[PDB]
Symmetry: D3
Subunit: 238 residues, 6 copies
Amino acid sequence: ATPHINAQMGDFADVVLMPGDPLRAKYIAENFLDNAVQVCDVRNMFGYTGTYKGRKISVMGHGMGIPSCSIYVTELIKDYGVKKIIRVGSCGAVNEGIKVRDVVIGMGACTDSKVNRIRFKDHDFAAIADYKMVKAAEEAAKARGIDVKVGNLFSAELFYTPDPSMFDVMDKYGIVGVEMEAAGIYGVAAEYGAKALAICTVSDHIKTGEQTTSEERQNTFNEMIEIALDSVLIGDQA
Amino acid sequence: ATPHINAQMGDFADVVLMPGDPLRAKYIAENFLDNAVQVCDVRNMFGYTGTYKGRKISVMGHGMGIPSCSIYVTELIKDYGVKKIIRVGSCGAVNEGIKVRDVVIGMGACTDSKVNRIRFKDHDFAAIADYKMVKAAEEAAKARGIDVKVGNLFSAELFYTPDPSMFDVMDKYGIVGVEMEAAGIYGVAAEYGAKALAICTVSDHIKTGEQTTSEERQNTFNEMIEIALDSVLIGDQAGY
Amino acid sequence: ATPHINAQMGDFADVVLMPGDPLRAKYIAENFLDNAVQVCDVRNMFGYTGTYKGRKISVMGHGMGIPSCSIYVTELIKDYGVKKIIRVGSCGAVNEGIKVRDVVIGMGACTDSKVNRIRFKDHDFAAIADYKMVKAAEEAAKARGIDVKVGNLFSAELFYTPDPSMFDVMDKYGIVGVEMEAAGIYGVAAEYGAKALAICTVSDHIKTGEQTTSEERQNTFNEMIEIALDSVLIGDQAGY
Amino acid sequence: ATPHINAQMGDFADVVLMPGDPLRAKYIAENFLDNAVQVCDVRNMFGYTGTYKGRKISVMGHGMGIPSCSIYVTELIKDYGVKKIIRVGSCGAVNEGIKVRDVVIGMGACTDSKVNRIRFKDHDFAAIADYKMVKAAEEAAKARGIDVKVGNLFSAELFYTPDPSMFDVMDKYGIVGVEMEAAGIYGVAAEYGAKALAICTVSDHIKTGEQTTSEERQNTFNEMIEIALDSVLIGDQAGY
Amino acid sequence: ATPHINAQMGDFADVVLMPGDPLRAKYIAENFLDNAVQVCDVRNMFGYTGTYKGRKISVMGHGMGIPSCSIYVTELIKDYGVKKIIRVGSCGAVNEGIKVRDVVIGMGACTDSKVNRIRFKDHDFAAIADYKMVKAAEEAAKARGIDVKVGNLFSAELFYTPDPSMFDVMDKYGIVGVEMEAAGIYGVAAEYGAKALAICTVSDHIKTGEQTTSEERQNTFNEMIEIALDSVLIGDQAGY
Amino acid sequence: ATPHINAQMGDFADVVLMPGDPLRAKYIAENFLDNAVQVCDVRNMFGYTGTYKGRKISVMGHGMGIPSCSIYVTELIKDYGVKKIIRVGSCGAVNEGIKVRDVVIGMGACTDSKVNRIRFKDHDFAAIADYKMVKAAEEAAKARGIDVKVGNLFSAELFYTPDPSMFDVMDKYGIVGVEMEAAGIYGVAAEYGAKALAICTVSDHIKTGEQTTSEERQNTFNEMIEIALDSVLIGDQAGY
Ligand SMILES: O=c1[nH]cnc2c(C[N@@H+]3C[C@H](CO)[C@@H](O)C3)c[nH]c12
Ligand SMILES: O=c1[nH]cnc2c(C[N@@H+]3C[C@H](CO)[C@@H](O)C3)c[nH]c12
Ligand SMILES: O=c1[nH]cnc2c(C[N@@H+]3C[C@H](CO)[C@@H](O)C3)c[nH]c12
Ligand SMILES: O=c1[nH]cnc2c(C[N@@H+]3C[C@H](CO)[C@@H](O)C3)c[nH]c12
Ligand SMILES: O=c1[nH]cnc2c(C[N@@H+]3C[C@H](CO)[C@@H](O)C3)c[nH]c12
Ligand SMILES: O=c1[nH]cnc2c(C[N@@H+]3C[C@H](CO)[C@@H](O)C3)c[nH]c12
């Protein structure tokens, strides 16, 4: 066991879906997997393993923000043999053409965190997803007739930002959604030589102020989950 | 409600103890407070309000790392009228003379986060506790005969750091414990005009490799909790 | 006319292939395009427009390094209506699994340049290609039976670097090739609302020392050219 | 013996009061210590040793600015065996409720200098005073009925700042005074394993433009001296 | 041969004039040198060697921007035995009193590039010319009755800058011209132990918007060439 | 009067020589100027005005380090009408061919200070001397048969540096002397539109350990004083 995960090697599948909300992981396990079993619950950070169409798949919360998800992702990779991480998150939109409930896929993630500069000799690391995982997710979406935008996320350090003018800069630069984790997840994946992807559902609009309820974020973002799960199967086939 | 707390204004006391672990907050509420009631549970981040020797006090988890605790601390101050935050955390020691289960108090907190540079025009903001809160914590510890070191914490971004040589730099500079939150909490406190303090129990020795179990971290760090709660009463005194 | 391009609006197609070397552009126009006409030659930076399998396409050199290519790409987009840029470059390999003449596609581009920090309030801009352009290139490669790797490039400021230890960091982080341009091109595309992709042919192995000749770089990297041109046709398909 | 101090080991007490102004050091020695003797004068930077209530105490100027004071503080600690440094300085107020002649105590010191980034791998070092020294000064002030604010100083590089908008930022973040030294002194004390504290008298109001005369700064800031001296005796107590 | 220069040792003189434009190099070689022969042409980057009043002199393009010119200048110095580089460039004026066709000499060059930080442990390297080269050029100009301003250039990374407000900062600080190369050439010269100088003719006024044609930049900036060539002879003198 | 200078407009000449050490300023005034009178003495920072060969000249200490000298030089320029500042300092050598007592001239000054980044939007300001002042000083030296090196100083923040490996980088980049002021003085001069120069006598060798005494630094660096004063008269010449 680790300080953060009360599980043993083998308890996780080699692919893990990760929302920041452990109650969304519970929702995913109970409603999309067969034979689901809870495998960890330290700090209430619930993780589960079950099967989807014959395929062993895990789902586990990562908490909010880069330093939180970095602990969980690093442990899964280095202690539990995990090969692929798919973050299944929420995000706030800054572009007028991107609506609440749209699904976006972060091929890259910008950030105002220092973590990748710490890794990368204070130069610019382009925090990117694994291409084949991006392609598999886009393809899974198309097959279900779900529209997705593939582009840059922005992984924010401060949800309550003292610099809101930066949202306009994000919009100008084509950022598809604001969250707080992907750039960190992609940094860990590169560091440890694993593969990662972040898929998010727009849960609020930073410009219009439109919101979803805590309950909707927890229980109703089903399209991203279907896309994520199908993309796992597509990945196995190639 | 806010996106992260399903409570109403008035539901929290004006002072809140905050461990990173919502199960530690549950433990504190159930074992140290009278009249305890759970006031929130979004994302499993449990928060409670009760009384300690008659004084209304809340306790709530803040999650791990600066971006997480910044969310919760900001909301408590700006949305729930909270005046004082006492982080009751764990930490790793870098100094050979600081032992697992030692209690330390962060008058200041160093960090490798960018959050305070973002706030402070890319200059060095010294992330500090409120002085009277520090003094009250130290004097609560003295009364109970619990030894404490008061000094600099280091709030790390990366628990699994790619730069372990930094630990010896921290030690050379007198850092008393490594955690992942205080510098962010002190930044929010200054930005929003409130007061904060971080008190931590050493749960790991970073030099030797010693690590307490998950369960120990959750339910057995009683000294810091006693100090924290007594410090609230001390700090309430007229003219303290 | 601009200071760097003596051409008229309309003289370029809405897609432009850009090698660093204006003589590689000449090679491409003369050997891969039909009815090519030279449209510019300021500073010996040759550009041409012709057709490929009926589709109007331009090819123009961008010189070496981020500041050079930034000028040409910016002008093409803002002054010449160009919508899509495909850099067709060379690069150095840092991974021993990657060989001279391998073709790599930069879905992202790391850099030690300050240009994106200048644009992006000193934060980390993830300099990325347009996804549909990456997909079209990878599919064009497959249709030709050409192996490719899709990953991070590193756009270097100093070819003669004072810090060769950085190559090992690049390799550890999975950089598929070192060049000097993509991160700048991707920054311009995003700043000006256009689309870009960099495909490169490995021309040097930085670990082993293998180095192709100038003539080889100029006239013999055909596979990347084939992939770029084919990818334009794929990218044109309605609904792609 | 050192390039900046023409004294011998033993000439300084283990506690040194340090104003920036060597003439304020002379004022202090002549008016607050008994039997003070001058022990150094290189570069006109006067230092003295005498007794206060029989207790050996030194006072010596440190010049203006982080690089100047760092030289002197470093030498005192590493070459003259000094254990505690109490800066007795002036400062400019940025908060309207803070007045000329108010005494402030720097539990922390923010800065726009690069010196601590140089020491601390380019991370944020929270430049803090020694806690017991803060507490002793605070308590000495209360015993004399002198109000003091305990909080963050801001140690500035440029007295004539090109960025006066930063003063508004300091005020919003609760900075109690602007001086030019504490963050550097605190950085030295941590690097060399000693203890330090900065106590300052407000000599300038940065918002209103009020400025005391050079005469006043040199010979009339008596309260901070009384507090500093009393705090030495308080801090000497075995179990303090 | 190198990947950028198809010449051998001995093909270049020990002093090389370098415009960014290889066609300006051709112009110089054809009209100001005797018996100029073309010694390289890779990537269309023309270089020539002839004589001026019997003295062996080379002229070669360096392309646009710091990363491009760094390649060529580094190769000339380390692979071709070159001792002195004289950039003969264009530049944009930011001062009202500096006019198109004025000749300026960069004793130093500011920059927004990261290259010298990369070289100089992230500190500030003052990118400066060789003093005697500055003196020879200034004296050559005076002997010709040509007025020159000697001061700081600014070597820009982005010609199409997203921060035009920086031009006013340059003007306030006395920058005599903005180009894109000098700070990088000066860093290479210092890194490799050679000597360099940048002399530039104002081709654009950034404040007034006035411009010259590409043809003018290429074929008509004669005063800087005459000054540069005269300065080589002056600088050759024993005891200069 | 200012808080740092107890003099009135007119008390200073329009050129001021400035050592860091106010006792060296006294020495210069008493032994090199005619009819010198002391014009200021706040914080023991002695300043004087007299004549050299009939020319009105001032000499005043600036203290140690960039923040200290920035105060005095800024006041001299903006409050006392000063046009030219000649720092007459000491420095440490890092190159094995530069010896104690050699005289060097800082045409540029590198620095690890943040001051010019603060001024210059976080870019690289090349902190340079005024060209005619450098030329006049070099030519004054030659006329006295005094050999001088003209190049980059390094203005250090931390005399007791925690990074002595930086000295090798300085040597590799051709730094002629290490002091603690020039880069600051040059930035002030540029900010306020005045002119400055730093001439320094090597007072110790950072590589070999060789030193000079406090008394030698104060009273025996005559060559640099003679050069500085002579350079004033040369610089006054019409048309120089
Ligand atoms: O406005 C926003 N800023 C930053 N992140 C988010 C997200 C995505 N998640 C939600 C959660 C903070 O609410 C953190 O894990 C990032 C939704 N909306 C926003
Ligand atoms: O070894 C350590 N490194 C960094 N932080 C901590 C802490 C403090 N908390 C505990 C939790 C990570 O275990 C995060 O909220 C920071 C205990 N031990 C260590
Ligand atoms: O070894 C290398 N380092 C950096 N870039 C390149 C490239 C790519 N191009 C080629 C050209 C430098 O030769 C510049 O445009 C970058 C090939 N090899 C290397
Ligand atoms: O207005 C101010 N700005 C910055 N520092 C100070 C100080 C403190 N000291 C005084 C002295 C500059 O006068 C230097 O040692 C810093 C007093 N007033 C001000
Ligand atoms: O307006 C300008 N900004 C930056 N550089 C230049 C130059 C000097 N050269 C010209 C060329 C870019 O046109 C590049 O090599 C730098 C002339 N005008 C300007
Ligand atoms: O070794 C050295 N490091 C930095 N500066 C100096 C100097 C020049 N002055 C002397 C003085 C520090 O002793 C400060 O004003 C800079 C001489 N030697 C050294």
